[model samples]
Structure formats: C-alpha cells, structure tokens
Target: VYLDRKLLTLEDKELGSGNFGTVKKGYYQMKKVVKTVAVKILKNEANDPALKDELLAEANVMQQLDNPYIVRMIGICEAESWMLVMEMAELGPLNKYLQQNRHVKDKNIIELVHQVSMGMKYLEESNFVHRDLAARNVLLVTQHYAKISDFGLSKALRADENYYKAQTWPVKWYAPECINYYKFSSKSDVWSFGVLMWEAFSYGQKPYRGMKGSEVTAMLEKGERMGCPAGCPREMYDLMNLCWTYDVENRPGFAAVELRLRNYYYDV
Candidate 1:
C-alpha cells in the first residue's frame, strides 16, 4: 500500500537531491522517519522508454533482498508518479558522515568495514553485483551500522549469463579494467571494493582527488593503483592493495574478503 495521504503532509524538509529527484524528511504512521524516498516523475520530453521496467526491476530486487545491512524499501507510491519509500537513515550518506566526523578511529573503521563486507557478501550470495560500491552509495544507519543503497547500478550475474559491459561508470572509484572499458565482471567489482575500503579508511576522501579522470586512467594503464592514505591500518591497506590488482584473477572474492576482515579483527 502507498503511504497514507496524511503522512505525506508530514514531509518536514528536503533532505537532498539527485539526478532523478529530491528527497525529503517526513513521518509515517506517527513514527519519526527520514522521508528521503526517491521519486521518479515522468517528464514528457525525457527519453525514458524503460523507466517502468527499471522501476519494476528495482522493486523486485529490493523486495527479495531483505537484510539489515541493506536499505529496506518500505513501500511505493504509484499515482501519476512513482516513489520508492525506504528506511530513513540518521547519518545520511557515508561521505557526508565521514567528512563531518573527520578521521574515524581504527576500531570504528574495522567495524564499518565488517558491516560493509557482510553486506557485500549478502549481495554476492544473492547473485547480485553492486557495480558501484563507493562511500557515497553507502548510508550510515548508526555509528557502527551501514546499509548499502543505490541499486541503480546493480546487476544480476548468473553462470549461464555472459559478461556485461557498462559504458558509463564513476571514474574515481573504478577498477583498472573498468577504466580501460573492458567487460565488468564480479572480479572487477572486487577492485571497486578495494577503492571503497580506501574511501572508508580515509573518511570519505575522494579517490584520485587531485587528478583528472584522464590522468587517473593513464596512471592505471601504467600499472599504478591508488594507495591507502596515512593513519589507516596496515592490514586494511594490504587488503585494499590486493583487491586493486590489475589481474582480476588475483583479487579475492567477497567471501574471502569477509573472512579476512573477520580474522583481522579476531587477531586484534
């Protein structure tokens, strides 16, 4: 069922805006909720023939992915427009949260890493590939808990299915192969995971912050990979380095990543 008409009046303020539309904070059923649901209003002139199909795909995926570390889609508002209602996270996006908090402690970083790794494991097991795994795409529900969001870039990979190529992607967070315009596979996603680890440790510092996308591409072509910033744990740094390998075969799978992170914490 859609959000009750009365609940719509509880929209407190605009939370943020994206390419599709703006999100706002509001209440539902007398509960304090971040009403930052993404709404896609159809525009007459926009070339969006597959908008409905994409929306349905998103709904199916969200409904099937029921996990604490994944943002929960509560319901949808379908009238003249479409809105996907989801849980309101207190800390908002990971980038904003980290920037506001400055450097996070080692213990906290490990905890966040564990959460993200677990979430990634969940997605992988479900045969879902989060093509975009970056700080901005993750949302903090609390200090120690994070939920992966923004499934617009996600794809389902199966054994029989052939490899898929993505034309457009975020440059800074991409792996070397992805930057080279090669087919994006689950292994390439592991590379992005490494960059994500760097972002998490550095408190949301942008990858290749000072360099242009082209320069970053050139460096990757020459076998140079992004390095972890100072103050990050050596173990985590090494893990990121392993994930950033040019040879996708050398990168660890999600299960391996989760296990390594778990073992790293157990030793501490």
Candidate 2:
C-alpha cells in the first residue's frame, strides 16, 4: 500500500539510525483519527536497487501479518526517499531499554519473553521464519509489551521450502545449522530467540560479550553454550539451552517454548 506524503507528518528529531537509514517519529492522519507511527527513511545517496527492493519486500511480508506481538505496518511512502510507515514502539529497542532501566522486575522480563515467544509462534504457524531474532530487533510498545520488529531478514517459506540459504548473517544469533550450512529455518530463529532471552536477562549485554564471530562459532562447534545470565531463572536458562541443542531436530519449536513460558508468565 502506498502512503500519501501529505497525510504523514514526521518530527525533526530522529528516533534512531542505521546502515539503511534513520527512523523518525511521525503522525499519520488516518480518516478521522491521528495515529503516532515510526517512519523509516531509506538512504537516498546509496541508490541501491537491491536495498530498496529488500525494504519493499519486508513491507510485503509485514502486510500479510496481523498479530499483536508483531509490529504493525501502516504503509510505504515513496517520495524523495523510500519511507516505511509503521506503528511506533515508543520505548524503542528492547536491548537499549533493558540497559536504560536496570530496575525492571523479573515478572516484566518474563512477560516480554513470553510475548516474543507468542509472536514467534504466530510466525511459525504463518509459514514465516524470522531470520533475525534478537533483543536489538525487538521493540517495546510498552514496558510490558514486546513486539517483533525488523522483518527485513524474514522470509515467507513455501510448503516445499524447508530452509533458506543466505550469504551473510548475524553470526552470534545464528544456530549451528545456520553457521555450518547457511541454512535458516524456524529452528534457527528459535536459537536466536534464546540469545535474546540471555540479552534481556543480562540487562542488554551482547551475547558472548566481546567475542568475535569465529570465536563464538568455535565454541558452538564444541557443543558449548553460554552460561545462564546472572540471576536468571533456572527454568528460563534451561529453555535457552534447549534452544541451543546441537541437533536442530531436537530444538523445541516456538509453540512448545510458548507453552513452557506460561508458568513464568502466570507465576503458577
């Protein structure tokens, strides 16, 4: 869907910026109501068609999704530069938020993790695999509500497609299979989510802190996984380990992960 530039008003302040572009807070005039949204403006000077296509493709995938735990896509604006309009997660990236607010309660952490698991479950059922699943890719709509964002690396798998092969990837967040075979599946995403769990519990510390991609790969090859983050729940750590199992087939799917997390979320 195309968005009218006139209907979207972006603030001068930037929320964040990346290799692709900058994100700014904006207001969308939707019918009778005004909605706060995030506008991701692409880098115009790069003039790379592939990047533009990738963003458009991401929007296409997002357009087909309708889950509360997944960020909502408003529309796309193609003017001087390509701008993707989507729902604003005011608190921004989960990692940054966690680092800024160390006082967040354990219950709040569990809720955020539970929400991400729910979102992953939805994507799994929808035949989509989020190639990038990490705390940095997750956004906090509120302290208690976490929604999956940045679908730029996500894919909608066909019935016959079991995995996707890509050239470059986030080394730390990938599963063993992904690193060894360049294969990405829902199970690979589960592995990344496990790392996200660690990031959240550790108050936003990067996985394998200060380790290079090759170093992390070497450790994983030896069947070693990161230890539990300090003060992390035993059950949560166990689940994360389960997600890191060397045998991809044995890794628990998102549905199973979501089911197991209910206890933590409900405190039962």
Candidate 3:
C-alpha cells in the first residue's frame, strides 16, 4: 500500500533507532480522523539497491499479514527515501515497557505473552517463520496488550517446505537447530518464544546475561534452561521448559502453546 506523503506529518520526536533506520512518531491526518503512528524513515545512503530490495521485501511480507496480535502497517511512503508507516504502540518494546513498569501484575504479563503466542500462531498458520521472536521484538499497545513486530528477519516457507536455511542469525534468540545447521522453521521460532517468555517473567532481564554466545550454546548442550524468574508461577516456568525441548519434533507448536498460555492467563 502506498501512503500519501502530504497526509502524514512526521514529528521531531524519535521513537527508536537501529542499523536499518530511525522510527519517528508521526500523525496521519485524514478528513475523518487523525491517527498517531510510527514512521520508519529509511537510512539514506548512496542509493543502495540492496537496502531498497530488503525494505521492499519486508513490506511485501507485512502487507500479506493480517492479525490483531501483530502490528498493523498503515502503509509505505516513498518520497526522498522509503518510509514504513505503522501503528504506534504507545508503550514501546515489551522488555523496556516491563522494565519501566516493574510492578506490572503477573496476570497482565501473562496476557501480554499470551497475545504474542497468538500472533505467532497466526504466523505459523500463515507458513511464516519469524527468525527473531523475542520480548524485544514485541510491542506493548498498553500494559495489558502486546503485538509482535520487527519482521525484518521473518521468512515465508513454500507449501512443500518446512524450513529455510538462512545465513543470517540472531544467535541469542536462535534455536539450537538454527545455530547448528543454520536451518530455521516454526519449531525454531518456538524455541525463541520460550526465551521470550523467560524475559517477560524476568521483568525484561536479558537471558543468559553476561554470557557469550558460545557459553549459551554450551549451557544448552548441558540440558540447562533458564530457571524461573522470581515471583513467576511454577506452571508458567514449566511451559517455558516445554518450548526448550532439545528435540525439535517434541516442541509444541504455537497452537498448543497459545492454548496453554490461555489457561494460565485465565488462571485455570
């Protein structure tokens, strides 16, 4: 979808920034309503085609996705440079949101994580593997609601394919199979989701904090999982362990995970 440059007003307020570009808070003015949004202004370079292609590919992938638990892209604007217009999550990334609101209720945290599981379930059903699924990649619409974002590393699998071999890696969030063979699938994403749960329960504490990537692999090989964070329910920790199953085939799919989270969220 193409967004009209004139209708969107980008403020000087910076929401966040990364290697790819800067996200600025903006407003999309329409005749009926004004929508507060986040505009990702692409980094300007020497007319690099690779960056253009990558942005276009990510946009295309997002356009096909429609889920309440996933961030909705407003549209894309291409003026002097490419701009990705998306709905603004007032509270920002989940990790930071939790860290700032340290006293957030456990039930609310469960709700947020549950919503992410629902989003992943949608992605799984859509045959897409989110190569990077972590608390940092999730955004808080409110203290009680969350949505999955940052699809820069997501890949869509063909009808006959179950996995994709990618050279790119976010080692810390990756599944063992991904780290070992560079192969990623829904199962691998599930493993990453487990780590995200740990982060959520830990009030956004980084997993394996102070450990190198090599150390992380060694620890996993030793059949060790991050212990439950203080105040986290034992049941929730058990669910996290299920996601950390070393055998990929034994890992529960998002469907099961989502349902299990629902039980916890409902305190069943």
By lDDT, the best candidate is 2
Error of 1 at 81 (Å): 2.8
lDDT of 2 by residue, 1-268 (tens): 5999999898999898988889999999998999999999998586889989988999999999999999999999988789999999999999999999999987789899999999999999998989989999899989989999999988899889878877766889989898888889998999999999999999999899889999999999888899988888899999899988888899989999999998767864
lDDT digits (tens) for residues 47-137 of candidate 3: 7888888887788888989999999988999987799999999889999988888899888888888999999999999999988899998
The TM-scores, one per candidate, come to 0.87, 0.97, 0.97
lDDT of 1 by residue, 1-268 (tens): 5655446533545677655555666444547644544333323236465875666677667877888888888776664456666777768888778888975687887888788888888887777877788888888889889888877767877667534676565877777777666567766777888888888888888888799889988888888876767788888998998888877777788899989998888778
Clashing pairs in 1: none
Where is model 2 more than 4 Å wrong at Cα? none
| Deviation (Å) of 36 in candidate 1 | 9.4
Question: What TM-score does structure 3 among the candidates reach?
Answer: 0.97
What would the C-alpha RMSD of candidate 1 be, to one decimal place? 3.0
Lowest summed lDDT window (length 10), candidate 3 = 165-174
Q: What overall lDDT goes with each candidate model?
A: 0.75, 0.91, 0.89
